[PDB]
Design a protein around this ligand. Sequence first.
Ligand SMILES: C=C1CO[C@H]([C@@](NC(=O)[C@H](C(=O)O)c2ccc(O)cc2)(OC)C(=O)O)N=C1C(=O)O
Ligand SMILES: C=C1CO[C@H]([C@@](NC(=O)[C@H](C(=O)O)c2ccc(O)cc2)(OC)C(=O)O)N=C1C(=O)O
Ligand SMILES: C=C1CO[C@H]([C@@](NC(=O)[C@H](C(=O)O)c2ccc(O)cc2)(OC)C(=O)O)N=C1C(=O)O
Ligand SMILES: C=C1CO[C@H]([C@@](NC(=O)[C@H](C(=O)O)c2ccc(O)cc2)(OC)C(=O)O)N=C1C(=O)O
Ligand SMILES: [Zn+2]
Ligand SMILES: [Zn+2]
Ligand SMILES: [Zn+2]
Ligand SMILES: [Zn+2]
Ligand SMILES: [Zn+2]
Ligand SMILES: [Zn+2]
Ligand SMILES: [Zn+2]
Ligand SMILES: [Zn+2]
Lengths: 266, 266, 266, 266
Amino acid sequence: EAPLPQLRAYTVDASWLQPMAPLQVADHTWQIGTEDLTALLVQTAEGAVLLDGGMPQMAGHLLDNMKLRGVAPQDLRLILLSHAHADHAGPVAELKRRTGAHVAANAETAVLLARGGSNDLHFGDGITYPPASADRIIMDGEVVTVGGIAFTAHFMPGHTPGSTAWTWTDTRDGKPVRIAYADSLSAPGYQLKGNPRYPRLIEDYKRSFATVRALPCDLLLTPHPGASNWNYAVGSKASAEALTCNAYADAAEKKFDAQLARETAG
Amino acid sequence: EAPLPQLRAYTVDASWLQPMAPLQVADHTWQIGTEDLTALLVQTAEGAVLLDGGMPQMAGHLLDNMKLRGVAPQDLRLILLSHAHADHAGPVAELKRRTGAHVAANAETAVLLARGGSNDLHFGDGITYPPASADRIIMDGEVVTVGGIAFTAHFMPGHTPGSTAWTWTDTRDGKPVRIAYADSLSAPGYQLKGNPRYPRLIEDYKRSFATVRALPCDLLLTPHPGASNWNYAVGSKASAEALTCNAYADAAEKKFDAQLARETAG
Amino acid sequence: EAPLPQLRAYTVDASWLQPMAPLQVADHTWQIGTEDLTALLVQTAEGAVLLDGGMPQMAGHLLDNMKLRGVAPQDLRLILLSHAHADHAGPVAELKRRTGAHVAANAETAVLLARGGSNDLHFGDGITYPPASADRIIMDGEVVTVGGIAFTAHFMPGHTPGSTAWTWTDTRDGKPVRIAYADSLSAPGYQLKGNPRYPRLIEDYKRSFATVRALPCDLLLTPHPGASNWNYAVGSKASAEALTCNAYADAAEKKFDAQLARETAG
Amino acid sequence: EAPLPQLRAYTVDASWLQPMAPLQVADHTWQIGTEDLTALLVQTAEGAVLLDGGMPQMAGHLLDNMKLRGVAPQDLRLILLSHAHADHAGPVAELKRRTGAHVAANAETAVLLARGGSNDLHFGDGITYPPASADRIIMDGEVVTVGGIAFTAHFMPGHTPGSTAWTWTDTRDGKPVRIAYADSLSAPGYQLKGNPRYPRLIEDYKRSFATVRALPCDLLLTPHPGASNWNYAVGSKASAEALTCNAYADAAEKKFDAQLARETAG
Ligand SMILES: C=C1CO[C@H]([C@@](NC(=O)[C@H](C(=O)O)c2ccc(O)cc2)(OC)C(=O)O)N=C1C(=O)O
Ligand SMILES: C=C1CO[C@H]([C@@](NC(=O)[C@H](C(=O)O)c2ccc(O)cc2)(OC)C(=O)O)N=C1C(=O)O
Ligand SMILES: C=C1CO[C@H]([C@@](NC(=O)[C@H](C(=O)O)c2ccc(O)cc2)(OC)C(=O)O)N=C1C(=O)O
Ligand SMILES: C=C1CO[C@H]([C@@](NC(=O)[C@H](C(=O)O)c2ccc(O)cc2)(OC)C(=O)O)N=C1C(=O)O
Ligand SMILES: [Zn+2]
Ligand SMILES: [Zn+2]
Ligand SMILES: [Zn+2]
Ligand SMILES: [Zn+2]
Ligand SMILES: [Zn+2]
Ligand SMILES: [Zn+2]
Ligand SMILES: [Zn+2]
Ligand SMILES: [Zn+2]
């Protein structure tokens, strides 16, 4: 008779694993991940910051791209996260071992990271990755500064309880560019209504749409570039179609409301 | 050009995942795992002890077999481990959540369990499983008692730094039966000589062969039943060919010495 | 010249350490702490729940009072917390070791408990106690059930980020009694305005006053009994002067507003 | 009647808390702790290593002395430990927060550090300090390298299960100086015989005396300088009376044997 099933790997679309060379976003900020997963390197005079790392197998590629930017592994000071799912926080444990960087995250993200994404409220154990510890717990609105560049956290729970937007002001052409790295606002396959593991899920998403609308933003980026209409594969045109924060929140809320009604409709 | 490779699942021989009904080993001790992975249930008047759980996907099967033995999930008091690899400690996190059982383990096993088997000294991240915490740290020779049944730990590092044998005295036919659950003594694909991550690996294995030879033992069991010549599929004959501790240690040391010479021979 | 100062113990008023016999609050609910620190035992047909434990040195007294109630150490299933300061979560690590109970707490409380109250946002390292791990992370509004008794969490951040109210329905004289165990709403010596470690502190307190006002409540209790006008020393009259949730929130908000104005006034 | 006792601070002799200016031990190695607690700074071209930090309240003094040596807080790369008691690992959590340094330690030291020294096998909760996590787990004989300087770990369990000696080769007057930082070999107030929490304590101490005798050593230092006959207060004569490793082990074993006989004599 049937044995128990084999473990199943977390597999993703090939484009999520397609390496790309560093793509400059602003004077200090570079996309160094893959064509379809964001990993932002912010280079300061006193070390570098990494916002997300993508999938677990991207660790070596990130370090290669850091080197192309002039950033040795030991020059990475800080890792920040949008949320601690395997496709965004995947390589954090290995990056910490190889660079000595600290991780700063809120308490929800810290607990999810420390169990390697296992016992996910919606996905169970299907997206487990190597666990890592947060070295600094941050609060809503708290400012983290590296090399004089200030990163502000904005909690936007929903996609995960610890989902966070990060904002900072870079420059281009002598003018300030307020960058907003807003987290995912999707709820893929989630039970939204009356979820015993997340009883206030709908209230949190609804508040998070409003938080995203209010972010300081001249240039929006998202963990999945397509969610904000970026196309990392087309170089200097990558940002051309990028959404505003208002438009990103509006699109996400329309999808959310439609899913809520479909969930009511079985 | 080539994308990065997909993550690869830890896949195992089908027999390792083949469920079996509880097989009685002695008056209080039952094999409740699969045909080719040991999971021992020891039933006391004040709750049950589980020694190993096998693969992550075995959690539900273990609880089903516990129920057949009269053990409700909440009746499981304690989980002990041979070593914290995915094929023996796989379901520990889920079992803790569903039963409330505590885990007792030495410090090496505790740290490996808490990172879900990631950053393995020999296997890297290939056998990651859901992380779990140890609630009680135990020392070499320490006695853990449940319902009056005393379990003694014997450290036998090598296969993992935290590899542990557990001994207890059960009964059969009114006579004592000294059970020894000795850990794996294999080194599959390991660099044995001059390993920078495990510099005293050879000294530890050699000492562990001697520890196994000295265990109090009328009946030897091992995490992989074939390592001690058990055959769980043949019921009342399962133990017929089981090795002594002396013979298990001798076979393991001969394989180890041969591998050492082959490693010297490239 | 002066050596560095000696470490300073966290010392408290004597009444906080004055043992008392169990005081019945409702049919299943007992105050089993000290005259001036709440520790609530809820006894079910399938084990007991403890809400808070007081100071670290109260562990033995709590177990003595449990025994007087018919609760053996192993009968304690679950520990819940108001917040993870030393005077309320102090003995949690020792209670877990001696009872096997699981701890359920939100992520903020879990991270503070796991560092033993060290690096407190307001108190630094002055109130460090033995660290403990949370076995179950709970979300706002999540229901935890033991022996059929359902406990609902209501997040009320401010006094700590993880501050939680717990509600359950007990009985007395054949009628339901909705019990609300609401956390502290004090801010003792806290910098309220522009606090870089807690930038939205004021917004959180203000929301928490509203949450407390809305709790289902026939009988309010608080970690410090005086905060809700209980007097545990007078037995059957202990609850006579107890505040409503509305009155507790109103008193706390008036104190908060006054402190805010004094902080503005240097 | 009597309330429960107040918590008691871990108080130490004043000389353990008496700051001193940096005292040069060899070309790259400086004592930067207090007159009676060792904290060794090793300065490399690629950052600094700290071996022990003393008491929790010494964090600021250590950073001041680092600054006098030209080491900014961010220049500290690595913290190593002799053992994780409050008088040697006390300030590790704060140093990690303020410097970004990683901690490397064996599994036993890592688990004790992570519970802040609470639930000590011999001292209970009396010497609890702020918990910290180890970022790198090291094995017996493993080499950790910073700026080209190689530090080798030698496990010497007894005083704690995780007690470790660290060796490295510095220079003086153009000649190599093999430095051995050997851990404590005391057993203050310990039950040595038949200790249920440490059943092989005597075997471990006896092996550790032999390990210390075998260390590569031109210059021995110890966490308590008096244990190896150092006197940090007399500057250029501080090392004059320092013991050899053989003499340190011999003195420690004689004290141990005498205590064993006194323990046998009640
Ligand atoms: C829109 C998506 C969907 O894809 C990923 C996601 N999901 C998946 O990759 C995918 C899925 O939802 O179909 C999945 C595959 C396998 C699983 O075991 C779980 C999820 O990553 C975990 C998720 O967060 O839902 N992430 C997002 C996102 O917004 O970040
Ligand atoms: C003899 C073996 C080999 O099989 C397992 C083992 N190995 C494997 O299952 C297998 C292998 O060694 O070929 C393996 C598959 C995939 C991997 O990524 C790593 C290891 O489990 C992790 C191991 O510990 O070596 N365990 C033992 C054992 O003695 O416990
Ligand atoms: C109103 C108070 C004040 O007393 C305690 C408290 N504070 C103290 O006990 C006390 C103080 O605030 O004066 C204190 C003594 C010593 C310290 O190091 C820190 C705080 O416990 C940590 C606190 O949370 O502020 N708790 C409350 C409370 O509402 O729970
Ligand atoms: C010889 C000693 C004695 O002093 C310290 C020690 N002990 C004490 O400081 C002291 C004592 O043993 O008398 C102590 C004071 C208070 C306590 O709660 C516990 C211990 O530090 C924890 C210890 O490790 O035993 N350390 C050593 C040592 O060798 O490192
Ligand atoms: Zn996601
Ligand atoms: Zn995603
Ligand atoms: Zn294995
Ligand atoms: Zn195996
Ligand atoms: Zn408090
Ligand atoms: Zn309090
Ligand atoms: Zn010590
Ligand atoms: Zn000491």
